[PDB]
């Protein structure tokens, strides 16, 4: 709730004059936040899938979904079906509030966090977060942490170009 009033009243008028769009409809938004898990433990351990089946729900209460790989892969010793990882999709109000957890709280718990990767855009206006450790925010509760797998987060915007999604995240507060 805090970021939306910040985004609507402050961030959206700021970038509008910065690149001279002809409407509020041309002012780009950041719609959905999709989070992949993608654990290949099911070849070895089906019980290790249950870790982050339960655990990712504690991050955002929208429960992730069974993601079955749609091609049997013998080089990974994997048949088709056979669930690999989970999928946290998130769009709407809590997702900017999820971003409120990200910038303000999460990132200083990356124990050697610095100016994060600038050129990790797809040439479209979308961004991926390189995270390898899941102990980022005080829910994680180390004594109940047996699995050490991190997390992959995708930023999806309505940015028609790319280099103003560059300038979008700066006004959001993404450090670089």
């Amino acid at each position: 709730n805090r970021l939306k009033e910040k985004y609507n009243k402050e961030i959206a008028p700021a970038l509008m004059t910065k690149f001279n769009y002809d409407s509020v409809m041309q002012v780009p938004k950041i719609e959905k936040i999709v989070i992949n898990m993608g654990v290949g433990d099911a070849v070895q351990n089906a019980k290790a899938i249950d870790s982050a089946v339960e655990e990712l729900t504690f991050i955002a209460g929208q429960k992730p979904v069974v993601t079955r790989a749609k091609k049997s892969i013998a080089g990974f010793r994997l048949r088709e079906g056979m669930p690999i990882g989970a999928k946290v999709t998130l769009r709407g109000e809590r997702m900017y509030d999820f971003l409120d957890k990200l910038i303000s709280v999460s990132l200083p718990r990356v124990r050697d966090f610095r100016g994060v990767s600038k050129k990790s855009f797809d040439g479209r206006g979308n961004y991926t977060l390189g995270i390898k450790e899941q102990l980022i925010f005080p829910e994680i509760d180390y004594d109940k942490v047996t699995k050490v797998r991190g997390m992959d987060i995708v930023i999806v915007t309505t940015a028609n170009t790319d280099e103003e999604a560059r300038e979008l995240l700066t006004q959001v507060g993404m450090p670089f």
Binding site: E31, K32, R124, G125, N126, V156, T157, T158, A159, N160
Partner: protein
């Protein structure tokens, strides 16, 4: 760069599935429903000749309401089109759920058509 299609074309893909196996013949007209975001519409169409028979809507100067998009607004026009189908008193029609579900205001139109006396 997220690109979603229009709702109308998404309606058109699921309207075209309906059009493949029921059509507006003689004395079984295609009683269609259009669902704009500020109104609602109804046409009675014979697809053999391409001739509309009767049509009314919430965008009509008579018997209007305040909401214009309520399910109760569908109850008003759901008998007036059937009153036009009582005006041209054919009263017998294969119903078209035209590109929409049989859930809400579409159901309210057809039930008001049944209660006014259209034979489904």
């Amino acid at each position: 760069m997220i690109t979603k299609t229009s709702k109308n074309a998404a309606r058109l893909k699921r309207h075209a599935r309906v059009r493949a196996k029921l059509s507006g013949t003689a004395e079984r007209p295609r009683l269609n429903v259009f669902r704009s975001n500020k109104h609602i519409y109804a046409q009675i169409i014979d697809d053999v000749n391409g001739v509309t028979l009767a049509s009314a809507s919430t965008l009509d100067k008579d018997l209007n309401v305040e909401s214009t998009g309520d399910t109760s607004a569908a109850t008003k026009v759901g008998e007036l089109v059937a009153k036009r189908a009582a005006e041209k008193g054919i009263s017998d029609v294969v119903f078209d759920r035209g590109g929409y579900l049989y859930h809400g205001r579409v159901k309210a139109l057809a039930d008001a058509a049944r209660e006014a006396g259209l034979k489904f």
